[PDB]
Amino acid sequence: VSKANVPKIDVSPLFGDDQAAKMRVAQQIDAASRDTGFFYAVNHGINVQRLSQKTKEFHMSITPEEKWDLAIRAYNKEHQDQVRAGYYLSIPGKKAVESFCYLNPNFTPDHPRIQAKTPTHEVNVWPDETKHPGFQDFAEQYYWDVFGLSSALLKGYALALGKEENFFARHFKPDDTLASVVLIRYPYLDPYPEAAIKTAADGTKLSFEWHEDVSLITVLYQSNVQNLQVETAAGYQDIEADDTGYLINCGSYMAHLTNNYYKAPIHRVKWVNAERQSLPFFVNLGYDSVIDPFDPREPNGKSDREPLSYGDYLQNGLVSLINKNGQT
Numbered sequence: 001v002s003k004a005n006v007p008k009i010d011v012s013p014l015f016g017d018d019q020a021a022k023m024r025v026a027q028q029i030d031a032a033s034r035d036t037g038f039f040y041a042v043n044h045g046i047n048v049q050r051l052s053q054k055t056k057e058f059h060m061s062i063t064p065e066e067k068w069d070l071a072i073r074a075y076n077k078e079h080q081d082q083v084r085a086g087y088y089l090s091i092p093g094k095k096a097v098e099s100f101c102y103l104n105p106n107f108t109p110d111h112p113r114i115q116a117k118t119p120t121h122e123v124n125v126w127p128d129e130t131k132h133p134g135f136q137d138f139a140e141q142y143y144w145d146v147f148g149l150s151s152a153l154l155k156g157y158a159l160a161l162g163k164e165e166n167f168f169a170r171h172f173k174p175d176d177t178l179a180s181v182v183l184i185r186y187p188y189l190d191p192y193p194e195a196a197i198k199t200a201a202d203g204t205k206l207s208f209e210w211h212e213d214v215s216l217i218t219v220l221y222q223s224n225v226q227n228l229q230v231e232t233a234a235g236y237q238d239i240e241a242d243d244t245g246y247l248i249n250c251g252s253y254m255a256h257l258t259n260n261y262y263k264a265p266i267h268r269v270k271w272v273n274a275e276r277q278s279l280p281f282f283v284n285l286g287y288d289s290v291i292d293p294f295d296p297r298e299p300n301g302k303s304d305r306e307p308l309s310y311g312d313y314l315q316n317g318l319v320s321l322i323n324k325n326g327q328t
């Protein structure tokens, strides 16, 4: 198996005022996006060590009782209002992965989208502060930390496509973003349940099958355990691990916007029997956000694709990914 070319891009100029240096970052983002579709953002300014430690303490100390009380509707029929936010239980002997997903901390009972019961908007559920002291505080702060990194990255993508630097970021707002954080635990198990292992067409043992991301972009931190593969025309290629940088890739909304100029890379997760973390931040816009599709390959920049409001894209995409690859 060959190894993917995933360049490391110093993204620090995107927080600054040196415009020429920003263009030079933009060029690298363009090049990576038209090649394998992945790059590592380095010099990002987020304390990922603290992130890994706090996430570990939570995963390793939450109990079955707390998991039921936090479970999404798929695992607890009482919680019909939790479709996105809450705990995704493992099933001993059958399902290895478990995770905790949370949304915009600004989604409160007094938020207009909650009052209106708009789909994909939910109020986060949290564990008891006395049993997990400082966890909600850390998790909400991390949301805004990685929100800030994603804002800067969206400036890079805009400049890379020949747009003003707020083309995407102007729709990425703290008051209505549907972005989500998912704290995924991949456990070490001995014996490892065979039902939790899928076999690809090419024979590779997998934890999660091929998919495109339902997102504009995805901003991913992972433990230093190699697991990801990206599909190319010549077959799947291994993405090497790096637990100091963020792995960045486009989702299918970007592919729609750019008439597939920046494709949503197809990727899968190899099975690896090792305790590790996968912590994606899915960059989603607002429910009513609409970006006019364009084609950077045509001089006029025009395309025949219909504008697609982000809320409808997200609702349709989340259901489709569950139906294709299963309940996570």
Ligand SMILES: CC1(C)S[C@@H]2[C@H](NC(=O)CCC[C@H](N)C(=O)O)C(=O)N2[C@H]1C(=O)O
Binding pocket: 084, 085, 101, 180, 182, 184, 208, 220, 269, 278, 280, 282, 318, 321, 328
């Ligand atoms: C490869 C990924 C980063 S992406 C893939 C898969 N992703 C999803 O199911 C999307 C969940 C989105 C979230 N509940 C929401 O409401 O927005 C997952 O988990 N996987 C991760 C992994 O398996 O490590």
Ligand SMILES: [Fe+3]
Binding pocket: 211, 212, 213, 267
């Ligand atoms: Fe993915």
